[PDB]
Tab-separated table of C-alpha atoms (C1' of nucleotides) and ligand atoms in Angstrom:
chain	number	residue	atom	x	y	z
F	1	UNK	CA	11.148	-24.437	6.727
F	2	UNK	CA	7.676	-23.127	5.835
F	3	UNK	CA	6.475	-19.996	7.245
F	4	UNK	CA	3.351	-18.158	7.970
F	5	UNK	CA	3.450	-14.575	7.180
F	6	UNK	CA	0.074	-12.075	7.133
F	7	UNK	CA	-0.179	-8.948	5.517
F	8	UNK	CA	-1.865	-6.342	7.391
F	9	UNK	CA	-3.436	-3.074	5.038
F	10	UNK	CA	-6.007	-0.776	6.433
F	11	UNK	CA	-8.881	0.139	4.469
F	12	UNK	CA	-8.554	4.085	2.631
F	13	UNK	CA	-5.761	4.945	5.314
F	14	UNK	CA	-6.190	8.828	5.884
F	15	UNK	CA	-10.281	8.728	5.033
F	16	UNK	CA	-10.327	6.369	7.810
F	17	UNK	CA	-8.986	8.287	10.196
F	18	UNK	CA	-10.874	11.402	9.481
F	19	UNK	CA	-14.091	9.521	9.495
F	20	UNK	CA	-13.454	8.156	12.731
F	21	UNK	CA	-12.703	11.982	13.748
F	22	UNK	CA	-16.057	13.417	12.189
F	23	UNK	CA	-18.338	10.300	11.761
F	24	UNK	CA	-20.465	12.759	9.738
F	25	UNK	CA	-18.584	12.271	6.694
F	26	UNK	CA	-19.213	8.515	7.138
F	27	UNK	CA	-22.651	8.869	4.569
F	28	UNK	CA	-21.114	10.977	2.140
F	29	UNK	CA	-18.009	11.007	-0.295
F	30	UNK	CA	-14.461	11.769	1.649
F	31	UNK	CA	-11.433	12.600	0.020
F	32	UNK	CA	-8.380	13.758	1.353
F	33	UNK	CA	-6.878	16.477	0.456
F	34	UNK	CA	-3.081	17.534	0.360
F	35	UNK	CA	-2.154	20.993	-1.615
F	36	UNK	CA	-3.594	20.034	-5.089
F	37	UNK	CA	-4.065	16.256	-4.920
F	38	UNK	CA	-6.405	13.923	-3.631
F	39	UNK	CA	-3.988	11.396	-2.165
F	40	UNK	CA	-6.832	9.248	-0.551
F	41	UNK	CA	-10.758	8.930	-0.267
F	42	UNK	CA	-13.365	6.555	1.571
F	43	UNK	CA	-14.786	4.051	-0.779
F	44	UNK	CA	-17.605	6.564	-1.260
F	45	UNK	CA	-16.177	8.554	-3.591
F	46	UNK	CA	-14.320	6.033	-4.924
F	47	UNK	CA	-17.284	4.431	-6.762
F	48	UNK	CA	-18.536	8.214	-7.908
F	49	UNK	CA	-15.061	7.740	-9.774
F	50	UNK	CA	-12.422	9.295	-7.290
F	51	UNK	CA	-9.160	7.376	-7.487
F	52	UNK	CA	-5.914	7.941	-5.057
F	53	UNK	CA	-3.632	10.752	-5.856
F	54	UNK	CA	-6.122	12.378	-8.049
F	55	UNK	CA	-6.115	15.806	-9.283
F	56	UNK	CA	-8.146	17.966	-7.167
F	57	UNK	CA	-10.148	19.530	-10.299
F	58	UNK	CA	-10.427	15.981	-12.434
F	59	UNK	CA	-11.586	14.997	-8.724
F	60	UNK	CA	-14.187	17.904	-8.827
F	61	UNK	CA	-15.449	17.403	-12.302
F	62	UNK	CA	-15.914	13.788	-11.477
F	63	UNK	CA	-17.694	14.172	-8.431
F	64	UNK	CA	-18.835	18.146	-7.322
F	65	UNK	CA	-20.456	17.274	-4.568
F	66	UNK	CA	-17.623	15.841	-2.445
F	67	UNK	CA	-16.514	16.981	0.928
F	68	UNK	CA	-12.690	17.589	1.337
F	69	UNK	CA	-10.423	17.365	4.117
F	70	UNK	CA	-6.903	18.839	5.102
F	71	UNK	CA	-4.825	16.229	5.692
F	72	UNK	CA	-1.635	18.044	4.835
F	73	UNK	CA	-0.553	17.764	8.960
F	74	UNK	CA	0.363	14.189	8.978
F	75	UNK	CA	0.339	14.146	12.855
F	76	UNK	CA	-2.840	12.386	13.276
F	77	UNK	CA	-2.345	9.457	10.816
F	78	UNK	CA	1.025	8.596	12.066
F	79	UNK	CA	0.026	8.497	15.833
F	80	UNK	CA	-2.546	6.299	14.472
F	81	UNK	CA	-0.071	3.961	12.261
F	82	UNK	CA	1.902	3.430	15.315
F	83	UNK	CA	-1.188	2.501	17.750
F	84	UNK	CA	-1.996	0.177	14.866
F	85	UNK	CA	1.691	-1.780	14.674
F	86	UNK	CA	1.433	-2.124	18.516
F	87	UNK	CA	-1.299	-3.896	18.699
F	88	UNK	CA	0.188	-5.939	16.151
F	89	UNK	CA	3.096	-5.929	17.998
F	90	UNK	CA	1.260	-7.716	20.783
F	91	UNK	CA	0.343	-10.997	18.950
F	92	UNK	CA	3.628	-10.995	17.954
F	93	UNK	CA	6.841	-9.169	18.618
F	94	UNK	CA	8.199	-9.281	15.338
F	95	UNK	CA	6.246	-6.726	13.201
F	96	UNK	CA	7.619	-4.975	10.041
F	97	UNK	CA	6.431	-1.998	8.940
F	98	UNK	CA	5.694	-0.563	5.672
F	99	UNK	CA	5.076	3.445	5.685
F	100	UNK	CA	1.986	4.255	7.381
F	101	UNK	CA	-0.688	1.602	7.094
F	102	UNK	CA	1.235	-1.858	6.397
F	103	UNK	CA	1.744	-4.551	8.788
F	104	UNK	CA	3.791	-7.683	8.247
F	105	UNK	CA	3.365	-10.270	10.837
F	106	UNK	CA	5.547	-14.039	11.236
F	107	UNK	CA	2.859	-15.855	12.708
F	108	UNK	CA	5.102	-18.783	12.296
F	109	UNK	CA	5.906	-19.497	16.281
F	110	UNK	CA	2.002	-18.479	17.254
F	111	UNK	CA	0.540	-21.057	14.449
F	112	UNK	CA	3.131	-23.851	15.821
F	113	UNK	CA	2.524	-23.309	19.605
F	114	UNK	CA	-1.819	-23.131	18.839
F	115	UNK	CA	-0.812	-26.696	17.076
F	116	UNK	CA	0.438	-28.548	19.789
F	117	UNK	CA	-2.196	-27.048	22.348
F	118	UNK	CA	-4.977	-29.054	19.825
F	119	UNK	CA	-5.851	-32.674	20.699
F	120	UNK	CA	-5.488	-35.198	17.997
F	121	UNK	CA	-9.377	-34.878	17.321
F	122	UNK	CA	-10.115	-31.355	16.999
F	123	UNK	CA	-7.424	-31.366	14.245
F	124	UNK	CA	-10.626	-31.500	11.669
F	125	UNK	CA	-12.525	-28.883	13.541
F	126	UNK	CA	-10.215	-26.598	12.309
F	127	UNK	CA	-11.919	-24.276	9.574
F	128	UNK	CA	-11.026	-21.077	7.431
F	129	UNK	CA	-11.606	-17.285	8.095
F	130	UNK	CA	-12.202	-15.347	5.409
F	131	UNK	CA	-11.903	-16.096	2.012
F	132	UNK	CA	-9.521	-18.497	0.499
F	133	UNK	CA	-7.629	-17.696	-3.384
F	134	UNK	CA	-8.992	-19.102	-5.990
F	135	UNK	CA	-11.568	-21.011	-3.993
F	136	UNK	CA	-9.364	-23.483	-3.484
F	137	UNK	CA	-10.245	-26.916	-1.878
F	138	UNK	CA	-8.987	-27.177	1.701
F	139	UNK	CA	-6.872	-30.775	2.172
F	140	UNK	CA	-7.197	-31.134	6.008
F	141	UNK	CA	-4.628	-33.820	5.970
F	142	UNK	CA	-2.136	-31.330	4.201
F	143	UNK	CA	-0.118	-30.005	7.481
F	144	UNK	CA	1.018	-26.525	5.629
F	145	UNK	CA	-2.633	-26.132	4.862
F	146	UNK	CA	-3.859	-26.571	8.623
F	147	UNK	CA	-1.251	-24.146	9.428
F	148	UNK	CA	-2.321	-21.926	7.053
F	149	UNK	CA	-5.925	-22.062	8.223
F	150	UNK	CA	-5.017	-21.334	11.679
F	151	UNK	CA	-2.741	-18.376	10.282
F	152	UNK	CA	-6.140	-16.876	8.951
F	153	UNK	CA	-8.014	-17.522	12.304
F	154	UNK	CA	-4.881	-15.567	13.807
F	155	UNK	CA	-5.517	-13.145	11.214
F	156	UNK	CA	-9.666	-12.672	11.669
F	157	UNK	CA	-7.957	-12.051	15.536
F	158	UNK	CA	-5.758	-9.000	14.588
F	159	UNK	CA	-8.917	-7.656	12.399
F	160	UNK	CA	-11.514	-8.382	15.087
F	161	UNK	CA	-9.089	-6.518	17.781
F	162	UNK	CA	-8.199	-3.434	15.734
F	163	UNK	CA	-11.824	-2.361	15.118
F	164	UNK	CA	-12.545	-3.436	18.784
F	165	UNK	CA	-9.845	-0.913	20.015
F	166	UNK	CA	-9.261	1.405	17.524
F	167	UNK	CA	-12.110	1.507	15.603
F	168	UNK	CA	-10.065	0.539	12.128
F	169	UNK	CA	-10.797	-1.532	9.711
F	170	UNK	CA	-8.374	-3.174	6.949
F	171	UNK	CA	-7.575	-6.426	5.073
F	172	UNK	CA	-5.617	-9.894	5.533
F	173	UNK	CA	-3.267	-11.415	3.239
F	174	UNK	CA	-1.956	-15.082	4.680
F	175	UNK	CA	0.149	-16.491	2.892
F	176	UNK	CA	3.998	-18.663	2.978
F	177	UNK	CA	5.979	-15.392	2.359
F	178	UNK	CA	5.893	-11.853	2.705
F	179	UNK	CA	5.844	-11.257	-1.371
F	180	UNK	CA	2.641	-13.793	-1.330
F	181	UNK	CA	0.696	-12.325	1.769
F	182	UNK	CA	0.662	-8.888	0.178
F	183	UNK	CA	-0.266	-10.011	-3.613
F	184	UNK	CA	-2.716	-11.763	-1.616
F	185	UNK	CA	-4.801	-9.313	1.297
F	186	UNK	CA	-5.689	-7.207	-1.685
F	187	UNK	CA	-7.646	-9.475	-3.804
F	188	UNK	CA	-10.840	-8.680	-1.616
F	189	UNK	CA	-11.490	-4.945	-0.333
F	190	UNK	CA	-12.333	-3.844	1.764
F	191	UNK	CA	-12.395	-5.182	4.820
F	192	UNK	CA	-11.802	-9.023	3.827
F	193	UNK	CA	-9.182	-11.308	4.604
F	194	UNK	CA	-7.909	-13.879	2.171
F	195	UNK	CA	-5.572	-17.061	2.846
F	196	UNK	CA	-3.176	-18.341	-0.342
F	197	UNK	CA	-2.742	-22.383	-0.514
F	198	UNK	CA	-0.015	-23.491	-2.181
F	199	UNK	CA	-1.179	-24.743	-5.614
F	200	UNK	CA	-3.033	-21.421	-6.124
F	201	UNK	CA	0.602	-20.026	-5.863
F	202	UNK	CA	1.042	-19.677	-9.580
F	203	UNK	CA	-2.088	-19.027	-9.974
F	204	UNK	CA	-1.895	-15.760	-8.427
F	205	UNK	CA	1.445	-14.827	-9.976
F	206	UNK	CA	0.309	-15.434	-13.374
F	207	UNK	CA	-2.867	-13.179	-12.529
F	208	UNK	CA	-1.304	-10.406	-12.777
F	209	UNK	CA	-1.289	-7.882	-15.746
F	210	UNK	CA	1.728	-5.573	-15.687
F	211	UNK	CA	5.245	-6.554	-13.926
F	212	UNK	CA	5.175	-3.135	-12.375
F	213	UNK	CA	2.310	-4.793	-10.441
F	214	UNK	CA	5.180	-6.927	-8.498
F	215	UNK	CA	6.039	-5.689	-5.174
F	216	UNK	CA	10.217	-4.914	-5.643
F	217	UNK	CA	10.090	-3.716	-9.748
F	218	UNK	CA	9.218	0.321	-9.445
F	219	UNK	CA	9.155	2.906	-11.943
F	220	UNK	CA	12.966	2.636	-13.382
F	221	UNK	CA	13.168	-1.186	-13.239
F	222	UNK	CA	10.193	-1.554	-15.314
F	223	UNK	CA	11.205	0.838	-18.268
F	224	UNK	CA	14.301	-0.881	-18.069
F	225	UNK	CA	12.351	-4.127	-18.693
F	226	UNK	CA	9.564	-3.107	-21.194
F	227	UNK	CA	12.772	-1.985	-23.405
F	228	UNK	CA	14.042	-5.720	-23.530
F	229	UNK	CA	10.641	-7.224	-24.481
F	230	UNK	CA	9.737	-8.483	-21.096
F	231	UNK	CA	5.724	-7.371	-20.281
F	232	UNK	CA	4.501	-10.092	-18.429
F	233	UNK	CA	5.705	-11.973	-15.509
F	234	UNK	CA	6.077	-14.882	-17.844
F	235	UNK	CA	7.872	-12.707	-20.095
F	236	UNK	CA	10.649	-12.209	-17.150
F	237	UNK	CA	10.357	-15.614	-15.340
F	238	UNK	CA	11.682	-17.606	-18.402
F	239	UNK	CA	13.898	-14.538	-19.681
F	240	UNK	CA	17.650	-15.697	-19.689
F	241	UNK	CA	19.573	-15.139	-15.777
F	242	UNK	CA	22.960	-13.887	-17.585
F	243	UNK	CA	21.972	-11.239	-19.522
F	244	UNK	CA	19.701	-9.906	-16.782
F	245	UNK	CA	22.225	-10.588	-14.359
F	246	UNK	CA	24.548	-8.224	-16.655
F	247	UNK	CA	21.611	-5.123	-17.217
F	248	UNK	CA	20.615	-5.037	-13.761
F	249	UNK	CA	23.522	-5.852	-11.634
F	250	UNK	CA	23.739	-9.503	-10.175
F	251	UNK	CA	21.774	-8.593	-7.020
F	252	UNK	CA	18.816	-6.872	-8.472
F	253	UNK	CA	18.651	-9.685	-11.522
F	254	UNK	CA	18.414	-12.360	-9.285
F	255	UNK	CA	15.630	-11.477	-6.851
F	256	UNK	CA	13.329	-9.765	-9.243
F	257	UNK	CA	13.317	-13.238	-11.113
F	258	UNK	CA	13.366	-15.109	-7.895
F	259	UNK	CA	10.632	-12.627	-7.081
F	260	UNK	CA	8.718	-13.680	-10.460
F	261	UNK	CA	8.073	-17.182	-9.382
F	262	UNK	CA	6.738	-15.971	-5.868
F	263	UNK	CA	9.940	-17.011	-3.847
F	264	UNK	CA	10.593	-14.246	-1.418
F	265	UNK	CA	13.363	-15.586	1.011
F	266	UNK	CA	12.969	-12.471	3.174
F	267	UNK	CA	12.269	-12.422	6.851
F	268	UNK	CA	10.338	-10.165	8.810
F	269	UNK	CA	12.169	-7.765	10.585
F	270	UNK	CA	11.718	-5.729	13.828
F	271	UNK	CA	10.842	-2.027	13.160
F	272	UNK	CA	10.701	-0.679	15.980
F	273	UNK	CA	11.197	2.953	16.583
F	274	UNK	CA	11.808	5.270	13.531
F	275	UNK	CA	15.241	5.520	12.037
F	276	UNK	CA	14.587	9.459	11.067
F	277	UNK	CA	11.953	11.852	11.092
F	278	UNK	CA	11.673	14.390	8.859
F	279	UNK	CA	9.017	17.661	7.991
F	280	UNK	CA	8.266	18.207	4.302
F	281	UNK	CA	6.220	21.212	2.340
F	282	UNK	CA	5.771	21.954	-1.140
F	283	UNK	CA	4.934	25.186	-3.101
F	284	UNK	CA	4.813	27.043	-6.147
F	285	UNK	CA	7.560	29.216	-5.931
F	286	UNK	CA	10.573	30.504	-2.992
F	287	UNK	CA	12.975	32.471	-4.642
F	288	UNK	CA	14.306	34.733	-1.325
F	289	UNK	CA	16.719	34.319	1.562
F	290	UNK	CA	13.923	35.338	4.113
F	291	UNK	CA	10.998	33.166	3.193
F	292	UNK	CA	13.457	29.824	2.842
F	293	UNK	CA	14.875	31.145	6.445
F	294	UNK	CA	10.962	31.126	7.967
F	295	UNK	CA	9.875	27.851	6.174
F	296	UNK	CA	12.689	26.347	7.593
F	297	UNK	CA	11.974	27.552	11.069
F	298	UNK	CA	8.548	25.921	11.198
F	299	UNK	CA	9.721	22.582	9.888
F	300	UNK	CA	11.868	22.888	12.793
F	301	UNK	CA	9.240	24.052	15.767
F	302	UNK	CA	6.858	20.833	14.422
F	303	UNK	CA	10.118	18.596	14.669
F	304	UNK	CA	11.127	19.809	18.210
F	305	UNK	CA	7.655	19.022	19.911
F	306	UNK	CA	8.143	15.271	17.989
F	307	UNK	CA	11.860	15.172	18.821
F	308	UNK	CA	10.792	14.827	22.252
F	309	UNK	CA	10.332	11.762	23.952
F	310	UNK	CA	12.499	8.458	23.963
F	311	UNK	CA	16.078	9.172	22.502
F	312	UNK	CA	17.527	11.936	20.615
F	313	UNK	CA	19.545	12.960	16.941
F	314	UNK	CA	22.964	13.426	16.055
F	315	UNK	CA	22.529	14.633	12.526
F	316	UNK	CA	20.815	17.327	10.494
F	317	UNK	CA	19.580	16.719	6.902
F	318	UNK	CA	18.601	19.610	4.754
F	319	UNK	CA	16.526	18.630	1.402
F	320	UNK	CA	15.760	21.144	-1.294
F	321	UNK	CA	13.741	20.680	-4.619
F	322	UNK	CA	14.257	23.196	-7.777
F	323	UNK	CA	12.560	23.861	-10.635
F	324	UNK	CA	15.716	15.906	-9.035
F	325	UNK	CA	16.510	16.924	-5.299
F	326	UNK	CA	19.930	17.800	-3.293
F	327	UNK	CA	20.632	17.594	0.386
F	328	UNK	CA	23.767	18.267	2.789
F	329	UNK	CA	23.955	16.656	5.949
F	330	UNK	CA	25.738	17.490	9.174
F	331	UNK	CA	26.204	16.558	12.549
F	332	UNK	CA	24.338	18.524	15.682
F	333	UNK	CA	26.384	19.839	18.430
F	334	UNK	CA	26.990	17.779	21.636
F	335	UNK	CA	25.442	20.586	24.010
F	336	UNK	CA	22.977	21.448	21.183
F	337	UNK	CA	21.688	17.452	22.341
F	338	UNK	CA	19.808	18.933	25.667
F	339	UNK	CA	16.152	19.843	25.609
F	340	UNK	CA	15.843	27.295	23.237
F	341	UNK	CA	17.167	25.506	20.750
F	342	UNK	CA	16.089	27.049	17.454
F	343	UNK	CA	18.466	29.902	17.371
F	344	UNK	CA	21.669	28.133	17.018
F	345	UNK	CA	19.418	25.121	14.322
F	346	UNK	CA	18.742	28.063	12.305
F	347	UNK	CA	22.103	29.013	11.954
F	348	UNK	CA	23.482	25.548	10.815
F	349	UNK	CA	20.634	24.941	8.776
F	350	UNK	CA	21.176	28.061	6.810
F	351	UNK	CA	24.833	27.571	6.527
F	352	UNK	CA	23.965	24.592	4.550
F	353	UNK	CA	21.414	26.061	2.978
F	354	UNK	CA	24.014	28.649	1.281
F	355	UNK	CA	26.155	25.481	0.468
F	356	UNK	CA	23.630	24.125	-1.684
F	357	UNK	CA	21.951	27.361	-2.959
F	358	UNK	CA	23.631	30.225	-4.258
F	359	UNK	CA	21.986	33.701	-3.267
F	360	UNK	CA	23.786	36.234	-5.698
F	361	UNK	CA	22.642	33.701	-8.459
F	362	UNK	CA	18.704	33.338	-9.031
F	363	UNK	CA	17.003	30.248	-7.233
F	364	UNK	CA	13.242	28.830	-7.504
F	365	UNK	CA	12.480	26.080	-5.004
F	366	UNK	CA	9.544	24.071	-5.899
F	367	UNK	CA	10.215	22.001	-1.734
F	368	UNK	CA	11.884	21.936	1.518
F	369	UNK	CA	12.509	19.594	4.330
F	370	UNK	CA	14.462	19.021	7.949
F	371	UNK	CA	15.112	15.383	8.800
F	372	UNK	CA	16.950	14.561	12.238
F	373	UNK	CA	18.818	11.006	11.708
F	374	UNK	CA	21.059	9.273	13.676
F	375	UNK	CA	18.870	8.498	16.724
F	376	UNK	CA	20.895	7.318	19.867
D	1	DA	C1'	24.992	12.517	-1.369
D	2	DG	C1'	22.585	10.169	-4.242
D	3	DG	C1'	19.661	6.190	-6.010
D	4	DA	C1'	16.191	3.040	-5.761
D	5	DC	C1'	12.336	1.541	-3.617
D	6	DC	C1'	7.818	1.733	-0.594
D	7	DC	C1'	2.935	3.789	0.968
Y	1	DC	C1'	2.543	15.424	-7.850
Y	2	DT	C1'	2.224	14.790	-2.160
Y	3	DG	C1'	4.314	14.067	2.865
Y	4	DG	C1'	6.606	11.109	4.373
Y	5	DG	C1'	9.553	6.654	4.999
Y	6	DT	C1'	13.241	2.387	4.212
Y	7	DC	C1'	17.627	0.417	2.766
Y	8	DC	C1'	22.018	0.275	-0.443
Y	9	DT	C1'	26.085	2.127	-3.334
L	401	LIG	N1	2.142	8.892	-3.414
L	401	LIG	C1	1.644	9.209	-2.099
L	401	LIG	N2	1.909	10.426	-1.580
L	401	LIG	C2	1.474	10.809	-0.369
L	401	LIG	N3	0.751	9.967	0.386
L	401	LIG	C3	0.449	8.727	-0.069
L	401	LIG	C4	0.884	8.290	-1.336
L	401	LIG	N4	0.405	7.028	-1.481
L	401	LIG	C5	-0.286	6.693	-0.374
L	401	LIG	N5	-0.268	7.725	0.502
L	401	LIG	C6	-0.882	7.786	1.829
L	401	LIG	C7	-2.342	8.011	1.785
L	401	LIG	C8	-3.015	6.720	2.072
L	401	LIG	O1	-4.072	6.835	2.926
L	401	LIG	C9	-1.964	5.784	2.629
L	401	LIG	C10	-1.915	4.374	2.107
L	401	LIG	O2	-2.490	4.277	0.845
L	401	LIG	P1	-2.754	2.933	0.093
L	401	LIG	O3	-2.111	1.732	0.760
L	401	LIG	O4	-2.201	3.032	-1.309
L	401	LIG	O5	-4.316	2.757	0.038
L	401	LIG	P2	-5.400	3.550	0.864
L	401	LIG	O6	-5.707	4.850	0.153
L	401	LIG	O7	-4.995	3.824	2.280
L	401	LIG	O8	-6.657	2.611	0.972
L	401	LIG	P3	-6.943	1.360	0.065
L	401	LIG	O9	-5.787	0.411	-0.127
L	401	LIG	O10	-8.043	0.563	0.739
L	401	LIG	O11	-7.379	1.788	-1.314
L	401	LIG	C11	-1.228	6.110	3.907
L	401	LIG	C12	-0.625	6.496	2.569
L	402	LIG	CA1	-1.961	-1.108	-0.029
L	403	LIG	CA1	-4.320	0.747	2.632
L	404	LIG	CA1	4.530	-2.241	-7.359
DNA sequence: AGGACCC
DNA sequence: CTGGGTCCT
């Protein structure tokens, strides 16, 4: 059947939190700051022509008088991610997520069970929150438009909570899928919700510019598309199945095109707890035995205080980056599984290390991370 | 172990 | 690019 899907997207993530920490920055351009980029900023700077992951000198001769943050330490923002998906997770069990500051919600079972607590009068009481696409006319007779509406009352609901009891603020998409709801919360930020109706569905499909603008196509797929004369979402929604199907593999062919007509079959599914957690850094140059062996230790003391708590890992991941990446994986020791620890971790971690990287040979490493899968 | 995607 | 994350082959 039809469902009811929201998309949940907090307003400039990371500036957020850090104006919630000092409020003082809350008059005054934020950006946030991680080694040489500007990966975020309030909506401040973004006016005095910041933009996300920005160069930190463009970003300084385009605005010299903004305030930076560290925000390298993502300990904050995820503790904060998390306290955001639970109180999603209280309207409804069933919340995806996606990275840090995305929310998807099937209001589905709510918007049925508000329907059937309504009396057969109050059934035209029933109005819209927030904004709805294209300024489309609201049929009250139309049942998937009542449910709909009541999705975006649901919606106004989540908002209204979050800033209650954590102070954020972000936007709404509802819409009939989860492809829809997130085309959809953007189109007013920030801080808005909007609701899609169904004949404004190709309406908002065709509104967009570039196909790399459609949540599933990334980097490679595009470039793969723009050399075969498909640019617009037209372009690929009336491009020929077969010879798609061929370039791009049967199962990638056939969802990007069912994807270009807005049909997203997926469901929402049940995050829950993380499936790995990981410590990254990136430099300039590491080039010795010693400084990769002390990076690597600090990775590790950051991921032992988070490795803590519910359950724990059975495998060791080892990423390097030189100058794309290379990794070798392992499992961790049975008695190693009961929280010193670091001694022996440094050992195994090193062992692959000199599995990957040869020492009597010259090595620069532009990154390095520790990732525990395998939770139990 | 890598590839592709996501923020 | 940064500091993470997900799933699939
Ligand atoms: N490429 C990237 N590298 C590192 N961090 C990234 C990133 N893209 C996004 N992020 C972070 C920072 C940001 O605050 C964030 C979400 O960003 P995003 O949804 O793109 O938009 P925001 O900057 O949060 O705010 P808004 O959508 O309102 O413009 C949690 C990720
Ligand atoms: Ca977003
Ligand atoms: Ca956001
Ligand atoms: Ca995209």
């Amino acid at each position: 059947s039809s469902r009811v899907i929201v998309h949940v997207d907090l307003d400039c993530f990371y500036a957020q939190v850090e104006m919630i920490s000092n409020p003082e920055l809350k008059d005054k351009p934020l950006g946030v700051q991680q080694k040489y980029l500007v990966v975020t900023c309030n909506y401040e700077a973004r006016k005095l022509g910041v933009k996300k992951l920005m160069n930190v000198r463009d970003a300084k001769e385009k605005c010299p008088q903004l305030v930076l943050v560290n925000g390298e330490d993502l300990t904050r923002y995820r503790e904060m991610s998390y306290k955001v998906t639970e109180l999603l997770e209280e309207f409804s069990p069933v919340v995806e997520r996606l990275g840090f500051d995305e929310n998807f919600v099937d209001l589905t079972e709510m918007v049925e069970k508000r329907l059937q607590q309504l009396q057969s009068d109050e059934l035209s009481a029933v109005t819209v929150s927030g904004h709805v696409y294209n300024n489309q006319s609201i049929n009250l007779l139309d049942v998937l438009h009542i449910r709909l509406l009541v999705g975006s009352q649901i919606a106004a609901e989540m908002r209204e909570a979050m800033y209650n009891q954590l102070g954020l603020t972000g936007c709404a998409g509802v819409a009939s899928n989860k492809l829809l709801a997130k085309l959809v919360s953007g189109v007013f930020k920030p801080n808005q919700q909007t609701v899609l109706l169904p004949e404004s569905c190709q309406h908002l499909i065709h509104s967009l510019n570039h196909i790399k603008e459609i949540p599933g196509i990334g980097y490679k797929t595009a470039k793969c598309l723009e050399a075969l004369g498909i640019n617009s979402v037209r372009d690929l929604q009336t491009f020929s199945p077969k010879i798609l199907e061929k370039e791009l593999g049967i199962s990638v062919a056939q969802r990007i095109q069912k994807l270009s007509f807005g049909e997203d079959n997926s469901p929402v599914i049940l995050s829950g707890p993380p499936q790995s957690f990981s410590e990254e850094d990136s430099f300039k140059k590491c080039s010795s035995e010693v400084e990769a062996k002390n990076k690597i230790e600090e990775l590790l003391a950051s991921l032992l205080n988070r490795v803590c708590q519910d359950r724990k890992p059975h495998t060791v991941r080892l990423i390097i980056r030189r100058y794309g990446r290379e990794s070798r994986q392992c499992p961790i020791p049975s008695h190693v599984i009961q929280k010193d620890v670091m001694t022996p971790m440094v050992d195994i971690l090193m062992k692959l290390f000199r599995n990957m990287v040869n020492v009597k040979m010259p090595f620069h490493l532009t990154l390095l991370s520790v990732c525990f899968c395998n939770l139990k």
